[PDB]
Design a protein around this ligand. Structure first.
Ligand SMILES: Nc1ncnc2c1ncn2[C@@H]1O[C@H](COP(=O)(O)OP(=O)(O)OP(=O)(O)O)[C@@H](O)[C@H]1O
Ligand SMILES: Nc1ncnc2c1ncn2[C@@H]1O[C@H](COP(=O)(O)OP(=O)(O)OP(=O)(O)O)[C@@H](O)[C@H]1O
Ligand SMILES: [Mg+2]
Ligand SMILES: [Mg+2]
Lengths: 470, 478
């Protein structure tokens, strides 16, 4: 048969009745196509996702768009599989809408393109990698004080106008250049004008040719907002599973995914959990996050921005999300206004990777010494106002002298910052930055002017700048 | 025919409802058509409520359900040692099937009042900050509680690794953990050789809620098999908070009215039923024992939350790890203010009991004096008791990762600290002092080490001072 009819329409929730022995499986996709027979009807094109089996050959679904115009009795067609989106090379440089349909005017995607199911069990225990590995981003601050992990999840925080977008673009550029991988950006429940601005900025920077974008913004229904993340993830998974690459995945706001899930659960009628969240909050978060893992042949690492309601880090949604994070990078408006880029806070940033077992004894010692120096400078900044610069001891003067150069050497010139500054970018390897920071610690460069360290790549460029300055 | 065959009426959110099955019993295993198993939870008047233990995506209304005749059970045996399995006993590491020949039920009665014996045998965890001032005996159940990223898993891994010499079987149960984390933990166990006697039970965050609910019972049922043979078992539950969350999800899906913080009424009964099976059997029951180390993740150190208080109300103590201490260099992060062992002390070796008995309260007093002395200056004896003792005690209790210390090597350095042989050397040198003193002892006091090992007491009233001074002579400041 493979044909049903609508029997209930209640907002985004639609009930469909099928022939006995022909019910679709959970999470399958159903299509409604209708032509207005007369003036009292409208044309309909809709996609439904199966959610429950209510019994009596009835299936409850969630619509991916508005349900206006539906009429009790319309024919429904079963696709026999979950939502399927195109994957492969054709997705690079294109914008999709959670159904896999393009939004930009470059045209449609041919029907012979390969498509993969949205829903999929997480990779097996056998297929995971046995050892932890460090993703070399090429940015000095991140590679020194908050390393990234292949297959790890990173939480991004910062105020407005500090550099999150330019940092994301530089990460994509560096990964595509050196590690040969690509990136997938998945906006979730955010501003449509912000999405358009991001598209234009990526086109200007030239990053757009190496990335795919799925938006599904605030004005979309909860059913679409709850699956944008999954469709972005399933287009990302293709390159790791089939080509063995290292891939980035950006989720604009993971909190909107939970909020959409809660809204969907309320429509399904389940009993509200602690603070009104869905009872399945942890399970949904696990089913999303556990697919972002390093495997034997590739890896996916995800940079995620997390909104915290009422700044309460004990709220159930941030509490559940934080259990999955492996690192955290915090931006500072103080550094941004001081002129330090990429303005990453060298003390608020934390990472699970920074351990002697993973990163190495030399790297660990250098990083800890840098953090101690910066903490001592932070303490002395109060005494400077309490007493005065000259009243401090000689060892404190040496500590301050080292700290200024350290804090300035943390800055870097980005490839995508050329459009502003006029200076080309630099990709600094982790071994080179460790050596440079050791050299600054040991006092080899105490005679150089502190401004020659301001915004520069390797340590040799610092002495070149000092030579050109004086 | 409805005695042994049923038909599914409803499917959704991991639970189902079947018609027929007139002769099923409460808690029986049932098998769907796909091979996915289930459990008969409710026996209503016309239908049966089934909890699905697996992927429910392949189950549709109208599918056939059949009995198995067995109350919920898991396979047990020595063939399970060195394997990674799910709460149903399915092998997961891919090293072929499991050749067990015996099973035990998930739900079993706990040992009675007259079946138990007072805990009197030490469990050497290999960590100073535990074995010194918060001892753990065999048959005890001790809670490990703290915030995220504090070392809770590291403590359990070190304890499991330290058991190689002792005749004890270890079971590590992971509930809601990340699969990469479980893989890395298994790799550390393999590297240190603990997989010769360890069973790993896993249920990651991607699994459905019933498996998370079910994993600890499978672990304890696997442990009971060795416990009732007169052996000693150690069981580690990596999160009970996530089990509680899974059970809350299950209850809300079953439409049971929630209580405080949306948890169901029997959230206490769940944990009490789980943890009451850990016991120290008597000589009449065989003398076996089972030890439990449940974990609880607090939020911002709120020890007064509902689940932390429920779990504290069951176990025989708690070890509190503080994030404020974990950050800024106190890496074992032991908080002597909130850590206690209610049954321990009677299960501590005589030498350690003789030496380090007062350290817990002395360190708590030092902690209070540390905040009190920030108000200015103090007495000469106050500065002595603070800086000479407390700082050195804190710096010597610190310990590196995956580096267990034998109990004799612990008691030597603890005695050296408590007798004033460390009061002179700088605070920034005592870790090197300990690191070299272990080698010095290995070279020159093997007979004292044998004395402690055999008689479980201090080697001599005074004789140790000669060797301590002999080491201090060859040791150099800075
Ligand atoms: N590396 C850099 N070099 C030069 N200018 C920079 C750099 N990073 C940031 N800026 C400046 O800071 C501005 C902020 O850029 P960006 O859009 O990335 O900020 P944001 O914090 O993500 O802001 P929003 O919240 O509006 O998205 C840039 O337009 C640019 O003027
Ligand atoms: N004794 C130690 N010495 C050095 N580092 C340690 C020690 N104990 C723990 N760590 C470090 O602490 C970090 C987290 O430890 P661990 O994974 O045991 O924490 P946890 O409380 O189990 O965390 P989670 O909430 O992720 O489960 C790791 O980087 C680990 O290397
Ligand atoms: Mg932005
Ligand atoms: Mg852990």
């Amino acid at each position: 048969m493979t044909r049903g009819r609508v029997i209930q329409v209640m907002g985004p929730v639609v009930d469909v009745k099928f022939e006995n022995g022909h019910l679709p499986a959970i999470y399958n996709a159903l299509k409604i196509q209708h032509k207005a027979r007369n003036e009292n009807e409208v044309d309909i094109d809709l996609t439904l996702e199966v959610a429950l089996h209510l019994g009596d050959d009835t299936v409850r679904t969630i619509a991916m768009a508005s349900t206006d115009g539906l009429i009790r009795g319309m024919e429904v067609i079963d696709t026999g599989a979950p939502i399927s989106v195109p994957v492969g090379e054709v997705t690079l440089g294109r914008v999709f809408n959670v159904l896999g349909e393009p939004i930009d005017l470059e045209g449609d995607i041919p029907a012979d393109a390969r498509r993969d199911p949205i829903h999929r069990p997480a990779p097996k225990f056998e297929e995971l990698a046995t050892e932890v590995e460090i993703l070399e981003t090429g940015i000095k601050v991140v590679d020194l004080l908050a390393p990234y992990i292949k297959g790890g999840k990173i939480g991004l925080f910062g105020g407005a106008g500090v550099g999150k977008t330019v940092l994301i673009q530089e990460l994509i550029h560096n990964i595509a250049q050196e590690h040969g991988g690509i990136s997938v950006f998945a906006g979730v429940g955010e501003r449509t004008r912000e999405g358009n601005d991001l598209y234009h900025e990526m086109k200007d920077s030239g990053v757009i040719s190496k990335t795919a974008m799925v938006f599904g913004q605030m004005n979309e229904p909860p059913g679409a907002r709850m699956r944008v993340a999954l469709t972005g993830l399933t287009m990302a998974e293709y390159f790791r599973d089939e080509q063995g690459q290292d891939v980035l995945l950006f989720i604009d706001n993971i909190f909107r995914f939970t909020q959409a899930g809660s809204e969907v659960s309320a429509l399904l009628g389940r009993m509200p959990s602690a603070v009104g969240y869905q009872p399945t909050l942890a399970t949904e978060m696990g089913q999303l996050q556990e697919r972002i893992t390093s495997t034997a042949k590739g890896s996916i690492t995800s940079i995620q921005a997390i909104y915290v309601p009422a700044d309460d880090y004990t709220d159930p949604a941030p509490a559940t999300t934080f259990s999955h994070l492996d690192a955290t990078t915090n931006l500072e408006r103080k550094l941004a206004e001081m002129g330090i880029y990429p303005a990453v806070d060298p003390l608020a940033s934390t990472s699970r990777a920074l351990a002697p077992e993973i990163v190495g004894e030399e790297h660990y010692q250098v990083a800890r010494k840098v953090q101690q120096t910066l903490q001592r400078y932070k303490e002395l900044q109060d005494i400077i106002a309490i007493l005065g610069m000259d009243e401090l001891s000689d060892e404190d003067k040496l500590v301050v002298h080292r700290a200024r150069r350290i804090q300035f050497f943390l800055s870097q010139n980005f490839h995508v910052a050329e459009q502003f500054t006029g200076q080309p970018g630099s990709y600094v390897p982790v071994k080179e930055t460790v050596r440079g920071f050791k050299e600054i610690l040991e006092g080899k460069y105490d005679h150089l002017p502190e401004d020659a360290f301001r915004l520069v790549g390797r340590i040799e460029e610092v002495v070149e700048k000092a030579k050109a300055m004086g | 025919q409805v005695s042994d065959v049923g038909t599914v009426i409803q499917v959704g959110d991991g639970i189902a409802r079947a018609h027929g099955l007139d002769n099923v019993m409460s808690g029986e295993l049932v098998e769907f058509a796909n091979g996915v198993m289930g459990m008969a939870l409710n026996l209503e008047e016309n239908n049966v409520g089934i909890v699905i233990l697996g992927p429910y995506t392949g189950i549709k209304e109208g599918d056939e359900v059949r009995r198995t005749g067995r109350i919920m059970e898991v396979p047990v045996g020595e063939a399970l040692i060195g394997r990674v399995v799910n709460p149903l006993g399915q092998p997961v590491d891919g090293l072929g099937p499991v050749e067990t020949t015996e099973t035990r039920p998930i739900e079993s009665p706990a040992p009675g009042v007259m079946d138990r014996r007072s805990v009197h045998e030490p469990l050497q965890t290999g960590i100073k900050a535990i074995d010194a001032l918060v001892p753990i005996g065999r048959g005890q159940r001790e809670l490990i509680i703290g915030d995220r990223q504090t070392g809770k898993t590291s403590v359990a891994i070190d304890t499991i690794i330290n058991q190689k010499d002792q005749n004890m079987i270890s079971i590590y149960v992971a509930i809601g953990q990340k699969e990469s984390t479980v893989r890395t933990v298994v790799e550390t166990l393999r590297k240190h050789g603990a997989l010769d006697y360890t069973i790993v039970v896993t249920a990651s965050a991607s699994q459905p809620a019933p498996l998370l609910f079910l994993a600890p019972y499978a672990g304890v049922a696997m442990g009971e098999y060795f416990m009732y043979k007169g052996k000693h078992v150690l069981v580690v539950y990596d999160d009970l908070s996530k089990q509680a969350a899974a059970y809350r999800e299950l209850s809300l899906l079953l439409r049971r009215p929630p209580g405080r913080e949306a948890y169901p009424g029997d959230i206490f009964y769940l944990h009490s039923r789980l943890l009451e099976r850990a016991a120290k059997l008597s000589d009449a029951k065989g003398g076996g024992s089972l030890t439990a180390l449940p974990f609880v993740e607090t939020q911002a150190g709120d020890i007064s939350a509902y689940i932390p208080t429920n779990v504290i109300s069951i176990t025989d103590g708690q070890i509190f790890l503080q994030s404020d201490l974990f950050f800024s260099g106190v890496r074992p992060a032991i908080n002597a203010g909130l850590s206690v062992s209610r049954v321990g002390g009677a299960a501590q070796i005589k030498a350690m009991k003789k030496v380090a008995g007062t350290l817990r309260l002395d360190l708590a007093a030092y902690r209070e004096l540390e905040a009190f002395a920030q108000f200015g200056s103090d007495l000469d004896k106050a500065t002595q008791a603070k800086l000479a003792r407390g700082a050195r005690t804190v710096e010597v209790l610190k310990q590196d990762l995956h580096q267990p210390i034998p109990v004799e090597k612990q008691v030597l350095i603890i005695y050296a600290l408590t007798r004033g042989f460390l009061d002179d050397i700088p605070v920034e040198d005592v870790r090197r002092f300990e690191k070299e003193f272990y080698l010095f002892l290995d070279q020159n006091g093997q007979h004292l080490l044998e004395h402690i090992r055999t008689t479980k007491d201090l080697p001599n009233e005074d004789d140790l001072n000669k060797a301590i001074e002999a080491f201090k002579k060859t040791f150099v400041v800075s």
